[PDB]
Amino acid sequence: IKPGRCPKPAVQEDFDAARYLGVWYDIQRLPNKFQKGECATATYSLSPGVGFSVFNRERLANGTIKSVIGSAIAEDPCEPAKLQFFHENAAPVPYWVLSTDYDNYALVYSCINEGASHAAYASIVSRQPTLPEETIKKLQGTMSSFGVGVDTLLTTNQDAAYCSAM
Ligand SMILES: C=CC1=C(C)/C(=C/c2[nH]c(/C=C3N=C(/C=C4\NC(=O)C(C)=C4C=C)C(C)=C\3CCC(=O)O)c(CCC(=O)O)c2C)NC1=O
């Protein structure tokens, strides 16, 4: 969908998927097919392998909320930050944890080589509906350092008015 093939950025070192569990609020995201809504959250829970179970939830414009259940598993237990996201009726897409503090923020990247083009996902997630605008900028610097159009990014709405039932 986007011209050019995938870059290979650096990922989180000594990534602990146990400290990555819990709820993560979406702060910024690259536009895509699937996330056509707001009030988006990801909840990661125990899974037998190297990874976690996935519950992604968002509220749509019409008010009804839509969730997906999935799995994120590391295929190389020695590289815990490079995981694969498996979901019902689809081929797995990558799930790379580029950077995280486990307690406040996380930067996740994903890219699929599509012939001469590529498809990509990117997400700034926080442990609260907001994240300090200074950390957003620092993470946008990392993203732009490897080709990510930080200017195509969409700020997810996490305002109580619209997300008044979560
Ligand atoms: C690297 C980033 C990234 C990947 C690999 C990704 C994968 C991904 N997210 C999806 C849905 C979704 N994904 C999210 C949200 C997230 N999903 C996340 O991985 C993160 C970090 C959030 C934000 C907290 C939500 C809310 C849906 C449901 C979309 C719907 O209602 O159909 C779907 C398919 C939905 C369906 O089957 O209908 C895929 C393949 N999304 C991403 O943003």
Describe this entry's structure for a reader.
The PDB classes it as fluorescent protein. It contains 1 helix and 10 strands. By secondary structure, it is mainly beta. It has one domain. The protein has an 8-stranded antiparallel beta barrel with strand order 2-3-4-5-6-7-8-9. Bound molecules: biliverdine IX alpha.
Global morphology: globular
Structural class: mainly beta
Tally of strands: 10
Name the helicity range. under 10%
The ligands bound in this entry are: biliverdine IX alpha
Figure out the total of helices: 1
Span between N and C termini?
33 Å
The radius of gyration over CA amounts to 15 Å
How would a crystallographer describe the biggest sheet? 8 strands, antiparallel, barrel
| Number of domain modules | 1
Largest sheet, order of strands side by side?
2-3-4-5-6-7-8-9
Order of helices and strands: EEEEEEEEEHE
Strand proportion: 35-45%
PDB class: fluorescent protein
Keywords: Blue fish protein, lipocalin
Assembly: monomeric
Entry title: Structure of a monomeric variant (L135E) of Sandercyanin fluorescent protein bound to biliverdin IX-alpha
List the helices and strands and how they pair.
Elements: E1 2-3, E2 22-29, E3 38-45, E4 51-59, E5 65-74, E6 82-87, E7 93-100, E8 105-114, E9 117-126, H1 133-144, E10 154-155
Antiparallel strand pairs: 1-9, 2-3, 2-9, 2-10, 3-4, 4-5, 5-6, 6-7, 7-8, 8-9
The protein binds biliverdine IX alpha.
Residues 24, 26, 29, 34-35, 37, 40-42, 56-58, 66, 68, 85, 87, 93, 95, 108-110, 121, 123, 125 line the site of biliverdine IX alpha.
PDB class: fluorescent protein
Keywords: Blue fish protein, lipocalin, Biliverdin-binding protein, red-fluorescent protein, fluorescent protein
Assembly: monomeric
